[PDB]
Design an enzyme around this catalytic site. Structure first.
Site, PDB file in Angstrom:
ATOM      1  N   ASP A  77       0.817  -1.211   0.000  1.00  0.00           N
ATOM      2  CA  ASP A  77       0.000   0.000   0.000  1.00  0.00           C
ATOM      3  C   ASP A  77       0.851   1.262   0.000  1.00  0.00           C
ATOM      4  OD1 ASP A  77      -1.425   2.107   2.247  1.00  0.00           O
ATOM      5  OD2 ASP A  77      -2.882   1.544   0.483  1.00  0.00           O
TER       6      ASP A  77
ATOM      7  N   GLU B  44       0.361  -1.083  -5.315  1.00  0.00           N
ATOM      8  CA  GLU B  44      -0.718  -0.133  -5.561  1.00  0.00           C
ATOM      9  C   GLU B  44      -0.084   1.181  -5.991  1.00  0.00           C
ATOM     10  OE1 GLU B  44      -3.947   2.608  -3.222  1.00  0.00           O
ATOM     11  OE2 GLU B  44      -1.915   2.310  -2.452  1.00  0.00           O
TER      12      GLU B  44
HETATM   13  C1  LIG Z   1      -3.698   2.767   0.214  1.00  0.00           C
HETATM   14  O1  LIG Z   1      -3.406   4.201   0.344  1.00  0.00           O
HETATM   15  C2  LIG Z   1      -4.079   4.978   1.429  1.00  0.00           C
HETATM   16  C3  LIG Z   1      -3.092   5.152   2.575  1.00  0.00           C
HETATM   17  O2  LIG Z   1      -2.967   4.002   3.396  1.00  0.00           O
HETATM   18  C4  LIG Z   1      -5.428   4.407   1.907  1.00  0.00           C
HETATM   19  O3  LIG Z   1      -6.261   5.469   2.337  1.00  0.00           O
HETATM   20  C5  LIG Z   1      -6.122   3.638   0.786  1.00  0.00           C
HETATM   21  O4  LIG Z   1      -7.376   3.147   1.277  1.00  0.00           O
HETATM   22  C6  LIG Z   1      -5.244   2.449   0.270  1.00  0.00           C
HETATM   23  O5  LIG Z   1      -5.721   2.104  -1.013  1.00  0.00           O
END
Ligand SMILES: *[C@@H]1O[C@H](CO)[C@@H](O)[C@H](O)[C@H]1O
Ligand SMILES: OC[C@H]1O[C@@H](O)[C@H](O)[C@@H](O)[C@@H]1O
EC number: 2.4.1.7
Lengths: 504, 504
Positions: B192, B232
């Site tokens: 993430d 991601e």
């Molecule tokens: C990854 O990025 C942010 C930070 O942790 C979070 O809010 C998102 O839900 C996740 O996709």
């Protein structure tokens, strides 16, 4: 400034929705009660990003509220106070829109502050971390100047872009505001956010020597136009005392939470100490259009060693008592921080912060009116208003909990309440007895009680404040007793609600 | 990664509220439909500042959800994907609380990023303005390190403190997360916000050469522990194409809005162009736990001359079509209208974004399942869910409109719907037909039609997508037609809802 009680109100939230209707409410339902009025920003627009404090055109009344003719009409019966928003303006203003379009080619480019304006050679972490903040995060946001991303200085919302109060264009703008106010028969000017008006690299950028020069220059400009200046300083109490000697008037922001402390615990010692050291060229309040200030009595935001009017644990307990008295309503409206000591303000109406206790509320108003300074009563407080959760859930703006829209029918419904009739009578008393234009003195024991006395030409008045006599939210025992002497002789009032004071 | 459809879900929002119940729903309601599961952050706590993405203790399951034994039990029937929150942690973590208390004397001081650790000699406006941000405002907030006010680097909420992924203590933490996942029978790791994981002065601090080194080093550590890496990255499409060659899997974030465009306008050329250049080592999605990304197909935000997969006018029209299709629901949740960490992501459920059109929705899933990569279906989408306006008004968190709490009773009620039965059968088809483990090919008929073909050992399948034959939100005409061959011969499905495909 005339030594009479004033009303602080939005032109649209008291009555049908216009300046004409607000004026009608003042004249018809508050005659003798409120002899002056502070009309909150009614410029174009009044409903933007910060309820009038982000003007597109400060010199033009919002057409939905009225005209400058309505202000001129109101001046015939009431002295008017209006804000001069000197620190910033809306990003949607013609001046800023010109900079977004043309960048450095805009004649309005030097009018706005960027990170480079104040720090041309860059900034260290100490330089940026040391800037005093009224809102979370750093005072910068992204805007494109002719396609180039720039960090514009924003002290409040990202929509409120800070102006360079020392630039030719910035100064010209400030003088256009002053000219418009003087031409529209305004008597008093509230220099909004003036404490942030001067940016000095390496300093806190709040109430620094450069800010003192700005305040002095703005005061001078006010006097040559026949306008009196009032400045708001939400800071460590010593900064409030410091600037007080340099201006006409300052707000007393320490008294509101000290009275919440006094009515919750019974201790009048902090109120006695404040009475001794406080600036007396003040404008007194309980509630304002913003939240209840806690930074105003606590320790300094930058330097934690400089202690407040009450210890840090008492400030922490004050915030927790408000949350308990409101049954969590104030918690839903106040943004969570690292600790209750990091809080700028607590969002709640003053009446609700006291747990809706009528005796505690009328007592707080009595002490307010008895301390040196011109008193102001905010409209929600004038009608002893409760926390508006309906508006808070609709707008998601924390301060809206204390900004209810009062229709004429709702004002009339509230004017039947004994606490509201008591406040109107207490304000009339404060406006009619010449004692308040005389000499002030106070006597105290240890804790328990404190007696405030005013002696005038043809009268005298003494208010005794004993919070120990009735602690708790469901209390019915009077905590404020009043004694006075006038034309008809000696009088007394042991209950300001059941037996309201009337001047012979 | 097993080429089977996976479910993305919160352990508490699918069932009674625990990992045990989520596992039960997967096994008894979705057997053969979802063979894998991406359980969203279930660490301590799951209900903090960012719904699990702000962990106090990443290695400990929240006691209210279950234990690591529950994750180990689920692994017997399902392949598990868990997040490794590598960029930040909660401020309430034992490591950060120690830095607040001891400051520079804390053993965890170099573990956290401040403005000074990245900019030791200070920073210019250009240095700070150049940092890539998904929304305006600087990535810094105030925290006291042993009484001294410091500006801590925070990419997301002020409560999510960014760690130094190049420090000894920072790396030790990341390895403790990887070790915990390996020992608890997890198969896949989702890194993430890894794109923000490396900070370097003078750069955008997003997908820079320093970030590539981090991604590569984290991948090395993943394979050594028997874990696969999924990254991601929400960025300009070319950055996704470039990084894809260096990792096991990337998400296909371009497909979700390209399909909304194709279904609203009838144009398949952008889908055809993307099919040609897209990274095939992908994890395909329609909806995620976040909003629908639009910058994932648009022009670059730091350089507007670099155009996207569709012109910027088409991106604006796509966003406006979602707002129109949802009757303003998405407009009330997107960007500035509610609390969001990303200004441009459109907050809506994928089903609601299509105006709840069954034929368009099943067609979108069919295309998703037919493009190379392992498909993932988000739980709200698995149950063809509509925008949750009630949860949105309760929290004001924009993304909550797409995060409905589904009880077992509501799951069973939704399982009776023809579109949900169609998706369950389509996913079962996607898991059972060996064609998907074979050769991929596609043909196109000039902007009007696109046929995706898979040929395996014992089967073949072709999906024809022609959105022009069924435009409008009240469409009943099928836009995805399927042809397949298996052990029982040649079969057809000219309507994926009325005639769902079943492998012999
Ligand atoms: C990854 O990025 C942010 C930070 O942790 C979070 O809010 C998102 O839900 C996740 O996709
Ligand atoms: O203008 C920004 C802020 O300035 C303060 O002085 C006003 O009292 C606030 O209502 C306002 O939000």
């Amino acid at each position: 400034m005339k030594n009479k009680v004033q009303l602080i109100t939005y032109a649209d939230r008291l009555g049908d929705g216009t300046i004409k209707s607000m004026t009608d409410i003042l004249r018809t339902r508050f005659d003798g009660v409120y002899d002056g009025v502070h009309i909150l920003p009614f410029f174009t627009p009044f409903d933007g990003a910060d309820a009038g404090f982000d003007p597109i055109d400060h010199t033009k009344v919002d057409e939905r509220l009225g005209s400058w003719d309505d202000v001129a009409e109101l001046s015939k019966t009431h002295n008017i106070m209006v804000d001069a928003i000197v620190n910033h303006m809306s990003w949607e203003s013609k001046q800023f829109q010109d900079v977004l379009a043309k960048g450095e080619e805009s004649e309005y480019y030097p009018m706005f502050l960027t990170m480079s304006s104040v720090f041309p050679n860059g900034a260290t972490e100490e330089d940026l971390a040391g800037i005093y903040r009224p809102r979370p995060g750093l005072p910068f946001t992204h805007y494109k100047f002719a396609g180039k991303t720039r960090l514009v200085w924003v002290s409040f919302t990202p929509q409120q872009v800070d102006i360079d109060t020392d630039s030719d264009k910035g100064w010209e703008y400030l003088m256009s505001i002053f000219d418009q106010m003087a031409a529209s028969h305004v008597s008093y000017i509230r220099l909004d956010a003036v404490g942030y008006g001067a940016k000095e690299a390496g300093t806190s950028c709040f109430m620094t020597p450069k800010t003192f020069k700005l305040i002095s220059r703005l005061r001078e400009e006010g006097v040559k136009r026949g306008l009196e200046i009032l400045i708001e300083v939400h800071s460590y109490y010593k900064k409030q005392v410091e600037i007080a000697s340099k201006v006409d008037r300052v707000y007393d922001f320490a008294l509101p939470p000290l009275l919440l402390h006094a009515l919750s615990t019974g201790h009048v010692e902090p109120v006695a100490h404040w009475t001794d050291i406080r600036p007396n060229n003040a404008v007194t309040v309980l509630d304002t259009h913003d939240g209840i200030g806690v930074i105003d009595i606590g320790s300094d935001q930058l330097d934690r060693s400089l202690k407040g009017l009450v210890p840090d644990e008492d400030v922490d307990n004050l915030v927790n008592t408000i949350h308990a008295n409101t049954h969590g309503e104030s918690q839903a409206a106040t943004g969570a921080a690292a600790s209750n000591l990091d809080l700028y303000q607590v969002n709640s109406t003053y009446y609700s912060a006291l747990g809706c206790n009528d005796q505690h509320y009328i007592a707080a108003r009595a002490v307010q009116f008895f301390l040196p300074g011109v008193p102001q009563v905010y409209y929600v407080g004038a009608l002893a208003g409760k926390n508006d959760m309906e508006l808070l859930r609709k707008t998601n703006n924390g301060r809206d909990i204390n900004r209810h829209y009062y229709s004429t029918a709702e004002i009339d419904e509230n004017l039947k309440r004994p606490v509201v009739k008591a406040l109107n009578a207490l304000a009339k008393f404060r406006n009619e007895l010449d004692a308040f234009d005389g000499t002030f003195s106070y006597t105290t024991d240890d804790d328990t009680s404190i007696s405030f006395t005013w002696r005038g030409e043809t009268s005298q008045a003494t208010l005794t404040f004993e919070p120990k006599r009735g602690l708790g939210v469901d209390n019915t025992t009077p905590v404020a007793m009043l004694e006075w002497e006038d034309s008809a002789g000696d009088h007394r009032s042991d209950d300001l609600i059941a037996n309201p004071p009337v001047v012979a």
